[PDB]
Design a protein around this ligand. Structure first.
Ligand SMILES: *[C@H](CS(=O)(=O)c1ccccc1)[C@H](CCc1ccccc1)NC(=O)[C@H](Cc1ccccc1)NC(=O)N1CCN(C)CC1
Ligand SMILES: *[C@H](CS(=O)(=O)c1ccccc1)[C@H](CCc1ccccc1)NC(=O)[C@H](Cc1ccccc1)NC(=O)N1CCN(C)CC1
Ligand SMILES: *[C@H](CS(=O)(=O)c1ccccc1)[C@H](CCc1ccccc1)NC(=O)[C@H](Cc1ccccc1)NC(=O)N1CCN(C)CC1
Ligand SMILES: *[C@H](CS(=O)(=O)c1ccccc1)[C@H](CCc1ccccc1)NC(=O)[C@H](Cc1ccccc1)NC(=O)N1CCN(C)CC1
Lengths: 215, 215, 215, 215
């Protein structure tokens, strides 16, 4: 695999978002992935709708949490692959209240056909990401509360509690790392990103990695 | 049952606490309940150790959440019924990182023999509370992000995601209410407290109500 | 016992010192204690000689460590209670090399008759300190490396590796604490001092507490 | 035996590391030795995990010190001979706080079958090193605080307090010397290395010499 990949440098990643006071991390992770995958299939980079999942995906729990794999399955099984644009279904849950699901008035921004669940193996995840793009991953982010920068080497890795987006890695660095897009504004971490050490299952990063399929 | 009960007025409730940047609400709810039950058995009101649970209760998940019933069971089945004083096992997870469990150097503040799981019935919970004191309850607190006061009447009631403590109710008010101790400092809500309407299962307040037993 | 005691406020404690690049913490702890005890017996507060112990106490290991209880025993058993002044036997080990022991040319600043080893009980240590003054204590100080201030509530308490001086406590504070004099200059911690939480055997503070006797 | 051996010139020695503000020298010495022995068995030179030992070896005391022989025994008796790669269990104790042991998420980099404890004889250690490679040694390093280069001839040799790695010697020099890898960055001494005189038991270098066995 390549020494280092940063999908942000390649123009594949939209701006860092703000889930606000809502446990919709799972929706931001799934949607960030679909955004990247749509772009990598040759379409323009476009912001897609977290609100669509938060309000409409009833297999997950809105501001009280969910699972990216559930979200992908809902998009395919219950929404026939359609993901609305952010512009036509904008985020409304920043104060913890999710408005009822609506269908009419929204514009489809991307279509997915399925999702893959990747091996629980960091080398394999890295090799897949290099060829196929950013990967939705569950993490234990309980120890991320005071992160301001650097490569994290003792992330508490005990309970998956968060969803985020793997956008790259660097295997040449003195401490190899993953690059991760968070959804806690650009004021958090490194302009909204975190580097965690790569190769030691920091934050349980390898446990539940997946991606939408546009193919 | 009485028209209104307020266990705070009776000196049965310790100060409002701060869980900080840690999903330890479950522990704050269990411990609040034990503090109150211990006082109600004739003992001085004493602050007890949330950290004991967060660090040592491996049937729950520290800053990534847990269940008050699991917490009551762990105390009895793994800790000989013992609950340490706050001052002997001080809270240190406020930045999201829990110290490792230590079995040594702590002082028993209260002892419990078990717990009771109350009917999913607000009237019966009220009656139990009037006689037996504050009750640990799970709630949907997803819609509590902007609350500064008054009686909450439109609580989003979809997913249990939080643990708090019922400390009283008022059936005489124009809109009858529960009085609830939160663990988000005295800055949140009504000096740390929330009133939610009583009789409409606001926030799913009746779904998982329980209390330690000191007797 | 008193709510709070600070022997510094009472004029019983000499300036914060610098052991330099030498593991003579044990000598600084023992000597700080003798300094305080001499003052409290009605003598002027005077700086005494760490170098005397580092060079001459062959039951301990100079810049490679020692035990305060050994140091007190050496002063009594091998030096017939005598402790030289700092001025006449000044500290010379700041670069890790301890000069050979000398006897002539030094001036006795204090005399001790023995030492007491206090119970492994923080309440008891506090009550003794209130009446009898600062107490030499062994601690696990491995987790003190980035301490800049505040009351420490999750001190790693695993292995006694350091000697320091208990100069006070405050039981009225929201988080009760001990006040401890370190020997790492005034640039470290709170002008050379640390507050650790009191009542939870932080840093194993209760395990090996002792004092010289001037009586 | 050869006139001079330098295992660095032969590519058998990894980069000089930094223990940071943690008394983990014992672990750096044990791990340095394993790295070298693993390479010398025909395998690629690989950085291995000091953190594995610091966190998980409970027969030693993490940042408060330990013994290389204890470390070799723990690897074999408690870890099935396995030593994880650095990149799979990265060092995170540099500020003096060791993360808890994790048994999961690591990758075996080397395996050992035991260790040998060498004679307290510098000539025999030299001969063993020429044939079998770098040797873990305990030293009195109390007098190493100002060292910037040259051959140390007056090392304070009183108390074993440090663990380092013999990587070579030169019997041809006007003053014969040992070559020693320290773990205090490349900023200390000779790009991280110290030369001490050979033949006078400098720093007590002959007292506790040992090496893992890969065979
Ligand atoms: C997003 C995580 S967060 O809020 O950004 C955060 C905050 C602080 C520290 C770490 C993370 C949500 C939070 C959900 C929540 C909100 C309020 C109260 C309780 C919970 N986390 C999730 O959605 C996780 C993500 C996840 C994805 C894949 C695998 C494992 C976990 N899932 C989750 O919380 N749930 C809970 C209940 N639901 C039915 C199952 C999934
Ligand atoms: C406390 C709730 S909170 O953080 O104060 C909060 C914040 C905003 C809105 C609502 C509530 C914790 C939060 C746990 C968490 C942290 C970070 C990421 C994900 C989750 N909530 C719990 O501990 C709940 C309480 C509960 C008790 C009884 C019944 C139902 C819920 N339990 C909980 O989250 N879990 C999740 C995982 N665990 C293994 C099972 C219990
Ligand atoms: C002082 C501690 S320190 O150097 O200020 C320090 C630094 C960083 C973190 C924590 C503490 C000394 C250090 C001795 C040392 C130096 C160099 C290499 C190895 C060790 N510590 C001691 O002197 C302790 C104190 C003590 C007192 C009472 C009870 C328990 C411990 N004692 C000690 O180290 N030893 C070692 C060998 N000696 C024969 C027995 C006591
Ligand atoms: C590493 C040595 S160091 O910190 O790099 C150093 C610094 C200055 C001068 C000399 C050396 C550690 C230091 C441990 C320590 C930290 C803080 C307070 C007290 C001690 N030293 C050790 O781990 C030594 C090494 C050793 C190996 C083999 C034989 C003899 C010594 N061992 C050690 O200190 N201990 C103490 C306690 N432990 C239970 C037994 C081994």
């Amino acid at each position: 695999a390549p020494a280092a990949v940063d999908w942000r440098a390649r123009g594949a990643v939209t701006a860092v978002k703000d889930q606000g006071q809502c446990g919709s991390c799972w929706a931001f992770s799934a949607i960030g992935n679909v955004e990247c995958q749509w772009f990598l299939a040759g379409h323009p980079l476009t912001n897609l709708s977290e609100q669509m999942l938060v309000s409409c995906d009833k297999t997950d729990s809105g501001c009280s949490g969910g699972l990216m794999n559930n979200a992908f399955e809902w998009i395919v099984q219950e929404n026939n692959g359609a993901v609305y644009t952010e512009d036509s279904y904008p985020y409304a849950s920043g104060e913890g209240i999710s408005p009822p699901c609506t269908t009419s008035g929204h514009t489809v921004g991307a279509t997915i056909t399925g999702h893959v669940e990747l091996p629980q193996d960091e080398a394999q995840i890295a090799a897949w990401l290099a060829v196929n793009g950013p990967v939705a991953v569950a993490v234990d982010a309980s120890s991320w509360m005071t992160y301001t920068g650097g490569v994290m080497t003792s992330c508490v890795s005990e309970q998956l509690d968060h969803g985020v987006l793997l956008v790259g890695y660097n295997d040449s660095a003195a401490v190899p790392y993953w690059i991760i897009k968070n959804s806690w504004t650009t004021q958090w971490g490194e302009e909204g990103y975190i580097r965690i050490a790569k190769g030691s299952n920091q934050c349980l990063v390898k446990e539940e990695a997946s991606s939408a399929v546009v193919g």
